[PDB]
Amino acid sequence: VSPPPPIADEPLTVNTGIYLIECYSLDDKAETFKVNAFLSLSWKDRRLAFDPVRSGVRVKTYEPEAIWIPEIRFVNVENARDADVVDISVSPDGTVQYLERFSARVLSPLDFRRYPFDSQTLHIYLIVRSVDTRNIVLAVDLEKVGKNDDVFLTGWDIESFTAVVKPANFALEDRLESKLDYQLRISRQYFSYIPNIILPMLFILFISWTAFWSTSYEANVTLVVSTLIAHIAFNILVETNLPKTPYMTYTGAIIFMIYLFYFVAVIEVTVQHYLKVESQPARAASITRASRIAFPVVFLLANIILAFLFFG
Amino acid sequence: VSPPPPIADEPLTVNTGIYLIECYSLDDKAETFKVNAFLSLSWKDRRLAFDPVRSGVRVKTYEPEAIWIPEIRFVNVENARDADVVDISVSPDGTVQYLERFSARVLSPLDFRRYPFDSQTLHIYLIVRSVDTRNIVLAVDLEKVGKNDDVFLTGWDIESFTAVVKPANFALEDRLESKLDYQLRISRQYFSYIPNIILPMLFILFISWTAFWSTSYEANVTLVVSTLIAHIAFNILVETNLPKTPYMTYTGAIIFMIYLFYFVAVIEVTVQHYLKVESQPARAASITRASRIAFPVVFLLANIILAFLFFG
Amino acid sequence: VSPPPPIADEPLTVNTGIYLIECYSLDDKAETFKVNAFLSLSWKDRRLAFDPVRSGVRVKTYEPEAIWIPEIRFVNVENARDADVVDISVSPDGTVQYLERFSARVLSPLDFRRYPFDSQTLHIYLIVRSVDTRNIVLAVDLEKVGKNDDVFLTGWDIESFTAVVKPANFALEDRLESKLDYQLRISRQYFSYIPNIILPMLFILFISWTAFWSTSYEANVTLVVSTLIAHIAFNILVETNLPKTPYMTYTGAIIFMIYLFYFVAVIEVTVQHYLKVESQPARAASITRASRIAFPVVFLLANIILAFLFFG
Amino acid sequence: VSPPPPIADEPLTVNTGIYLIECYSLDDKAETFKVNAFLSLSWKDRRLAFDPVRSGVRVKTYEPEAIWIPEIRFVNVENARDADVVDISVSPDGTVQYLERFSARVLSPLDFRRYPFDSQTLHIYLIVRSVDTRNIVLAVDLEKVGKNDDVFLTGWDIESFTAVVKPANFALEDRLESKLDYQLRISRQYFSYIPNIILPMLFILFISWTAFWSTSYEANVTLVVSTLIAHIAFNILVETNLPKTPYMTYTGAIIFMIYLFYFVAVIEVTVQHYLKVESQPARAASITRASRIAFPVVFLLANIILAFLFFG
Amino acid sequence: VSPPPPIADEPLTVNTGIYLIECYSLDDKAETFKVNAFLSLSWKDRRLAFDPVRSGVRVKTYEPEAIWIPEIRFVNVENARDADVVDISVSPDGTVQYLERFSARVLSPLDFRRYPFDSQTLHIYLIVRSVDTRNIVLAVDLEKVGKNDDVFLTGWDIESFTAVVKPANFALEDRLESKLDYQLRISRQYFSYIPNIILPMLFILFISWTAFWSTSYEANVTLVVSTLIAHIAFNILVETNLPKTPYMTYTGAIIFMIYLFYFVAVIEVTVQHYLKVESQPARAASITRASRIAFPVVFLLANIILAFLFFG
Ligand SMILES: [Cl-]
Ligand SMILES: [Cl-]
Ligand SMILES: [Cl-]
Ligand SMILES: [Cl-]
Ligand SMILES: [Cl-]
């Protein structure tokens, strides 16, 4: 049809709101995730105003191809949403109630610095492009911004779903455009990692540390190298989760520290054997008895320092 | 067209029913699964009533674009169903028989606490949204709620397919909506796990337990550590099935207990060697002869307790 | 348009036939497989009869939207076929020749009891639903049921493609429906398994069996346990083929028997060492010399019995 | 519209030609590969002939829905091509120039007998189906059969792209049909296999062969069995490339020969130890010194014979 | 409609420009990557010129089906772009402003010679095909060629986005066509490789090099062979990144050099043992003390030479 006449030469205000129904398929590698929710638009148009007393009907329904509908689009989506118009009602005063259901794929960056214990914010952007005849600005209606109680996501705890009412009215392509932001804060469940990744790793490391209570060179070599192979296999198991990041994560630092500890243990075993062969048993005994105590204290101190750096 | 006139000002009742034809692709990671079935709608409209004596035809078929059809949609689907209209017949009294075939992807939560022996319920939700002019409520017709005898699913035993007749008439978006629930209970087949996952694991553990019948330190170390590596490889084999859950499963608990047992066995071997070197052979012999009997009794007791906790 | 008038009040007969062009993508996990073939329909309609002498044309072509076409659908398909109408010709007497090309995905159960040497039958179901005005029954025309000589499938030998002429005229949804069955028998090529899976497994088992010709405990332990690890790795290699079945397959039974043999070998080695340490060398020598002969005879007998049970 | 009148009662000739733009995604497992190219059709129709002197225009463009276009389809494609009409021009004499762009997925068999050094021919089939009124035959225009210089395929060297001008005018479904064949010969690049698969395998085999220069039984057992495990792991690495074939390939034969060599080496080590224990050292020394020379000569001879059989 | 009349018989000039919004899914194996951006077309047509003084409107919007739009297509795309027309405005003088949003998949070759430290250029080609009536040439408008500040790509640092203004006006299919080139230079982030791939590899190699400080043959054999197995496992870990290339990469050369070093170390250990057994201990001691120093110097020199060759 056409934009409404400027009765007061004012920018047009539309009220929005998204009622989440379900979210799923949070792909961490591609940083994409899908939604399925509602969309309520409530603008005002005086050209559609009628008299309810004469007509005798409280609200009379028009056709989507019979009226004008402002274009509402998402920024960070691979393809356009699948719009399923559900209801349209026109109030006698002029306000038009609109509703629709859609599903789309959304792109949002993710931070994996504190991989086991991290909280992510998922952003959904709503943008309307002003036409030359009339200016249209966005708004947020708090009575429709919510989520369904059946919204479930595997491995995450949904905490809140709020929208920032302040729009960023920038200018792109010589046109003024508004933008709304919807934030969905989530938190990862870290229960299934303590008995799956952390504790077996510590058990293997402690098993490898038993070589300081022995004097047989072959047994020590077997212990240390076979535990190193087991460490590599467990890293193979763990590697199916971590994406590629340009910074240093917690898990990568821990794994590198474990590799360093294995190298130092091999060096110590070789030094002990070499001193024992060269007819200096007392020095080797002192070195191994001091290594026994020095290894785990240093391991605990390094873990404490890494935790104090990454988490504060 | 339009909703029928309120002849008695009563809510409109439609009778439903789904005849399953085939189900497949039960993805446990994403908790999605596809269907392909029928859909029977039988409502009443007096505006389409005709005289069969004058016309001479028992039932005369209309066109889907010539009548009104109430909108029936699913809640937990990624995309809209692929409707394939099959037949429409109008009875002289006013009842309209409708039929269609569809396929869709359904989301439903799954519980993996008792992973090898679990029963899941798959929910399909049917919702109709009332218009302002007329109120429409749902109903269940037991004569059409069934499944085809050729319905097959890999690894599961379909037990029943029933629909709860009671609808949850809540109010969403200032509109009254009804909801129907269809439940499909299934059970997992656990035959192919006893000789594939459980028994080889026990065999490897028993092989590792033979180190208590020997006194050679190198042989014991080789046995225990190589069996640990084999355990890690078998866990690699098993890991291609279990999803990520926020609670403790049966398999995870068993694997953690196995890791603990390996650690304790290594500790015992080291203690025996250290006592033997320090010129105390009798104490080492007593310790190993008591460990021989203590290990499997404790293993069986822990398994019994875990079974008694997870399954009752 | 409308069904033809009942000139004799007889059920309508249509002649079918599928000319396979290519089949591919036989997914064993999901038990789906795709086709691409023709479809010939030859029914009779007296309303389209014309005079060829007056018109002067042997056959005159109509439009698919100008005539009536009975609906032909598949039962076990995920989505509807992609119909590509190719030709339509109307004979003067009344017979109508119809032709089209399509591609679809078909679901059919598979039996994996004799996994290396198995023959499968792939079923394609054709169903027509009778209207209330006229009854339509199916038929098979043997002159069009065939396959193209270029039909190739990876790993399978296509043997035949026949259709059962007898239809199952059951009653579903208070309507009489007919059904046709097309069977495509195939056989798996088992050449690439003898030198890939079977023989290396036997070689590793025979290598592990050499521990009965030695008296060094450490060497025996190394041999047996390292061969067990190699067995687990080879099972990792093989596992990328077998689906999940509710019954006992041939390969699973063989693998379980191999695990049992490894366990018994470990037990025998431990017993020999324990008897040797306890100052009873003659008994240990007798036990090992009897085990040398007892192991392979028992292995061959068990293999023979499993083959006699699974294959007859 | 309709086929042109038989001015001379001659079969209609259309000139074809495909100008390749890009090819990609050569899936060896499914034997499918995608294209994107042009398609030039140049037939003759006297009904569209006009006078250029009177009109004053050299060529006047019609509409695709305003003229008749013969149907051109591919045989070995999963789905129909995505036709994008680009240009249509009608010459005054009657010849019609047609052009379009398309992309499709093509199925073609592949031969993997000489897997590292093989040349494959990719076939694209063009078929036109004659109507009852007029007969249409195909032809090849050499001025348009070519490939773009930017055509790139990962791992293959495109050599030629030619079309066989001779059509196979067979009869299918009681209709005469013509067929054209386009062949694209390619060759695999085998540089990245010599330092990736072949040489490390030889290095591991040579490492395992060092056991003939030693007399320690435990060291020999460790060497041979650990090298066997490394061989299995490297086969795991290599297995991600070879499809399933019903015949014997080069790589499979080489791997089987390697397994046989490992088995024979284990047998030789066991025999040497048994003879050494039984107080016959000279015989064991002679056997090992003869094995030292016999192993690599036999390996080289077997490799030469396999190469002479598979490649000539 | 039709091309504009040749007011001066000049080639038609259109001004282009792409404003990137987001890029993602850079598949290195298939060398494909997706985009989502804008597209501004600004051509001149005198037939749409109007009088703004008489009409009283600054710019009046037409319909996409009411005007002519030159066809703009991409060369290296699998499928056609999803055009979403956003705005069209006609200036009184005759210039027409056009805008649209699209998403597409683009193919571009990649160079993996310097895999960890490489810079790639991604090409997007724009082509317009001249009609016989009028000639259309392309142009670049620098005021619209840019990227959004939120453009993010995983693992890469976007540096610039420029378009070469010079078009390649070649002749294809007897028609003159222009082409524009858009280049997006990126660089890989190599932080997450130093502590993930390089350093553990060096640690394992250094661990294996400790065998020159020992005289026990069994311990040396265990060390070297087990470290070789760990090397193969780590290569398994690394192999999930490198595609297949017809030339020699940096990583492949390094891995081959590591394999060569392992082989030489095994040879040295065997030689030392053989000389020790044959009653020549001084020569073996000299050989091992010289190998101790010769191995790492040679390793460093080879690494320096490879770096000097691949990177200059
Ligand atoms: Cl959108
Ligand atoms: Cl729906
Ligand atoms: Cl269908
Ligand atoms: Cl096609
Ligand atoms: Cl395009």
Side-chain angles (χ1 to χ4, degrees), chain C residues 19 21-22 24-25 34 36 38 40 58-59 61 82 84-87 89 97 99 101 103 144 150 152 154-155 189 191-193 195-196 199-200 203-204 206-207 210 213-216 218-220 222-223 226-227 229-230 233-234 236-237 292, chain D residues 29-32 73-80 107-110 125 127 129-133 172-175 177 179 217-218 221-222 225-226 228-229 232 235-236 239 244-248 252 256 259-260 262-263 266-267 270 273-274 277:
Chain C
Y19 189 73
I21 286 188
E22 45 176 327
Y24 50 99
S25 303
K34 332 213 213 202
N36 185 357
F38 271 58
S40 193
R58 53 201 80 150
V59 291
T61 290
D82 321 61
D84 319 327
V85 179
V86 177
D87 190 0
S89 67
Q97 206 171 110
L99 188 79
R101 182 184 176 182
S103 68
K144 324 283 212 193
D150 312 0
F152 86 103
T154 310
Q189 289 151 354
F191 185 174
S192 68
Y193 299 79
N196 287 357
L199 287 191
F203 287 168
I204 301 173
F206 292 172
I207 283 179
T210 65
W213 271 275
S214 165
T215 57
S216 175
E218 286 80 1
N220 298 2
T222 303
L223 261 172
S226 307
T227 43
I229 302 184
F234 208 99
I236 271 177
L237 265 163
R292 282 182 206 168
Chain D
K29 293 179 179 179
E31 290 158 58
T32 87
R73 296 176 176 116
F74 297 104
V75 188
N76 54 4
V77 293
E78 309 190 344
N79 306 65
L107 281 74
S108 192
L110 296 178
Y125 290 114
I127 168 160
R129 188 177 180 89
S130 177
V131 299
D132 58 301
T133 66
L172 175 64
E173 295 295 328
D174 188 14
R175 301 294 276 241
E177 309 180 64
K179 184 182 285 185
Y217 185 52
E218 286 80 1
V221 165
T222 303
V225 186
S226 307
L228 172 70
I229 302 184
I232 298 186
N235 177 52
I236 272 177
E239 201 40 70
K244 145 51 192 154
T245 62
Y247 40 65
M248 193 84 267
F256 183 72
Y259 276 118
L260 207 50
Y262 272 114
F263 183 57
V266 168
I267 279 290
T270 301
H273 183 239
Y274 190 63
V277 171

Side-chain angles (χ1 to χ4, degrees), chain C:
Chain C
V1 178
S2 66
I7 182 64
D9 201 59
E10 85 289 352
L12 190 81
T13 58
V14 307
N15 310 61
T16 36
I18 295 183
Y19 189 73
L20 272 189
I21 286 188
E22 45 176 327
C23 84
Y24 50 99
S25 303
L26 191 150
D27 189 3
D28 289 345
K29 293 179 179 179
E31 290 158 58
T32 87
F33 91 85
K34 332 213 213 202
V35 299
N36 185 357
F38 271 58
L39 184 73
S40 193
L41 295 175
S42 313
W43 77 95
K44 158 82 177 192
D45 197 359
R46 302 151 297 291
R47 297 179 305 186
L48 314 178
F50 71 104
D51 197 296
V53 181
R54 295 165 52 242
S55 313
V57 55
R58 53 201 80 150
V59 291
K60 65 175 207 304
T61 290
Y62 293 27
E63 184 173 359
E65 290 83 3
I67 59 170
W68 71 298
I69 303 172
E71 74 295 2
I72 301 310
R73 296 176 176 116
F74 297 104
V75 188
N76 54 4
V77 293
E78 309 190 344
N79 306 65
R81 70 181 185 247
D82 321 61
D84 319 327
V85 179
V86 177
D87 190 0
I88 285 185
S89 67
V90 177
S91 162
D93 54 0
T95 58
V96 168
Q97 206 171 110
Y98 170 95
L99 188 79
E100 98 179 53
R101 182 184 176 182
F102 66 85
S103 68
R105 197 158 343 126
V106 178
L107 281 74
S108 192
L110 296 178
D111 170 320
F112 291 117
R113 267 175 178 116
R114 327 172 182 181
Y115 163 67
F117 334 105
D118 47 355
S119 306
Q120 319 282 0
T121 304
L122 307 190
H123 280 291
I124 308 173
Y125 290 114
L126 266 192
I127 168 160
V128 59
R129 188 177 180 89
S130 177
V131 299
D132 58 301
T133 65
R134 190 59 167 292
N135 282 1
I136 297 169
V137 315
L138 274 164
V140 177
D141 196 2
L142 275 298
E143 278 67 359
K144 324 283 212 193
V145 185
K147 67 175 181 301
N148 189 237
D149 317 302
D150 312 0
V151 165
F152 86 103
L153 190 58
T154 310
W156 300 85
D157 296 310
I158 295 92
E159 298 187 303
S160 72
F161 183 63
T162 56
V164 186
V165 296
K166 183 64 62 181
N169 286 38
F170 48 68
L172 175 64
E173 295 295 328
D174 188 14
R175 301 294 276 241
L176 288 100
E177 309 180 64
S178 304
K179 184 182 285 185
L180 282 183
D181 190 318
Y182 283 70
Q183 314 164 119
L184 179 83
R185 288 151 181 114
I186 50 187
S187 296
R188 184 176 260 126
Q189 289 151 354
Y190 59 93
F191 185 174
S192 68
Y193 299 79
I194 312 296
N196 287 357
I197 300 174
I198 298 183
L199 287 191
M201 261 304 202
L202 279 190
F203 287 168
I204 301 173
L205 186 74
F206 292 172
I207 283 179
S208 73
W209 276 350
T210 65
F212 310 128
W213 271 275
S214 165
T215 57
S216 175
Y217 185 52
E218 286 80 1
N220 298 2
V221 165
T222 303
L223 261 172
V224 183
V225 186
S226 307
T227 43
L228 172 70
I229 302 184
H231 167 57
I232 298 186
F234 208 99
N235 177 52
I236 271 177
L237 265 163
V238 178
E239 201 40 69
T240 69
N241 283 299
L242 291 174
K244 145 51 192 154
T245 63
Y247 40 65
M248 193 84 267
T249 72
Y250 198 51
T251 309
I254 291 182
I255 295 177
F256 183 72
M257 201 191 41
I258 284 180
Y259 277 118
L260 207 50
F261 266 84
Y262 272 114
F263 183 57
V264 178
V266 168
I267 279 290
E268 198 276 310
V269 162
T270 301
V271 163
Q272 174 199 301
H273 183 239
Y274 190 63
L275 291 188
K276 203 183 42 212
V277 171
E278 212 208 38
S279 77
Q280 263 163 300
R283 185 178 173 181
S286 67
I287 289 183
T288 189
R289 171 171 59 109
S291 74
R292 282 182 206 168
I293 278 150
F295 263 79
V297 177
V298 166
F299 185 70
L300 174 75
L301 279 197
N303 258 17
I304 275 175
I305 281 181
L306 294 177
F308 184 110
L309 292 175
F310 265 93
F311 290 72

Side-chain angles (χ1 to χ4, degrees), chain A residues 200-247:
Chain A
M201 261 304 202
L202 279 190
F203 287 168
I204 301 173
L205 186 74
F206 292 172
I207 283 179
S208 72
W209 276 350
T210 65
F212 310 128
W213 271 274
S214 165
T215 57
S216 175
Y217 185 52
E218 286 80 1
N220 298 1
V221 165
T222 303
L223 261 172
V224 183
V225 186
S226 307
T227 43
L228 172 70
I229 302 184
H231 167 57
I232 298 186
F234 208 99
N235 177 52
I236 271 177
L237 265 163
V238 178
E239 201 40 70
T240 69
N241 283 299
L242 291 174
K244 145 51 192 154
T245 62
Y247 40 65

Side-chain angles (χ1 to χ4, degrees), chain B:
Chain B
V1 178
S2 66
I7 182 64
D9 201 59
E10 85 289 352
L12 190 81
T13 58
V14 307
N15 310 61
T16 36
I18 295 183
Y19 189 73
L20 272 189
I21 286 188
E22 45 176 327
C23 84
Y24 50 100
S25 303
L26 191 150
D27 189 3
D28 289 345
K29 293 179 179 179
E31 290 158 58
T32 87
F33 91 85
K34 332 213 213 202
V35 299
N36 185 357
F38 271 58
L39 184 73
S40 192
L41 295 175
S42 313
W43 77 95
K44 158 82 177 192
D45 197 359
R46 302 151 297 291
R47 297 179 305 186
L48 314 178
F50 71 104
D51 197 296
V53 181
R54 295 165 52 242
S55 313
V57 55
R58 53 201 80 150
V59 291
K60 65 176 207 304
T61 290
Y62 293 27
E63 184 173 359
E65 291 83 4
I67 59 170
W68 71 298
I69 303 172
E71 74 295 2
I72 301 310
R73 296 176 176 116
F74 297 104
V75 188
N76 54 4
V77 293
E78 309 190 344
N79 306 65
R81 70 181 185 247
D82 321 61
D84 319 327
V85 179
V86 177
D87 190 0
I88 285 185
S89 67
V90 177
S91 162
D93 54 0
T95 58
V96 168
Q97 206 171 110
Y98 170 95
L99 188 79
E100 98 179 53
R101 182 184 176 182
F102 66 85
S103 68
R105 197 158 343 126
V106 178
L107 281 74
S108 192
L110 296 178
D111 170 320
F112 291 117
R113 267 175 178 116
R114 327 172 182 181
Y115 163 67
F117 334 105
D118 47 355
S119 306
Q120 319 282 0
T121 304
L122 307 190
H123 280 291
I124 308 173
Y125 290 114
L126 266 192
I127 168 160
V128 59
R129 188 177 180 89
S130 177
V131 299
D132 58 301
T133 66
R134 190 59 167 292
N135 282 1
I136 297 169
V137 315
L138 274 164
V140 177
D141 196 2
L142 275 298
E143 278 67 359
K144 324 283 212 193
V145 185
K147 67 175 181 301
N148 189 237
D149 317 302
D150 312 0
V151 165
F152 86 103
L153 190 58
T154 310
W156 300 85
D157 296 310
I158 295 92
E159 298 187 303
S160 72
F161 183 63
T162 56
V164 186
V165 296
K166 183 64 61 181
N169 286 38
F170 48 68
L172 175 64
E173 295 295 328
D174 188 14
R175 301 294 276 241
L176 288 100
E177 309 180 64
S178 304
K179 184 182 285 185
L180 282 183
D181 190 318
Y182 283 70
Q183 314 164 119
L184 179 83
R185 288 151 181 114
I186 50 187
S187 296
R188 184 176 260 126
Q189 289 151 354
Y190 59 93
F191 185 174
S192 68
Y193 299 79
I194 312 296
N196 287 357
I197 301 174
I198 298 183
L199 287 191
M201 261 304 202
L202 279 190
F203 287 168
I204 301 173
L205 186 74
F206 292 172
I207 283 179
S208 72
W209 276 350
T210 65
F212 310 128
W213 271 275
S214 165
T215 57
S216 175
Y217 185 52
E218 286 80 1
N220 298 1
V221 165
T222 303
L223 261 172
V224 183
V225 186
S226 307
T227 43
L228 172 70
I229 302 184
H231 167 57
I232 298 186
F234 208 99
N235 177 52
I236 272 177
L237 265 163
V238 178
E239 201 40 70
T240 69
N241 283 299
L242 291 174
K244 145 51 192 154
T245 62
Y247 40 65
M248 193 84 267
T249 72
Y250 198 51
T251 309
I254 291 182
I255 295 177
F256 183 72
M257 201 191 41
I258 284 180
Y259 277 118
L260 207 50
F261 266 84
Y262 272 114
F263 183 57
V264 178
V266 168
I267 279 290
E268 198 276 310
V269 162
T270 301
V271 163
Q272 174 199 301
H273 183 239
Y274 190 63
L275 291 188
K276 203 182 42 212
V277 171
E278 211 208 38
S279 77
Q280 263 163 300
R283 185 178 173 181
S286 67
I287 289 183
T288 189
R289 171 171 59 109
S291 74
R292 282 182 206 168
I293 278 150
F295 263 79
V297 177
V298 166
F299 185 70
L300 174 76
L301 279 197
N303 259 17
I304 275 175
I305 281 181
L306 294 177
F308 184 110
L309 292 175
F310 265 93
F311 290 72

Side-chain angles (χ1 to χ4, degrees), chain D residues 42-57:
Chain D
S42 313
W43 77 95
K44 158 82 177 192
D45 197 359
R46 302 151 297 291
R47 297 179 305 186
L48 314 178
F50 71 104
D51 197 296
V53 181
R54 295 165 52 242
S55 313
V57 55

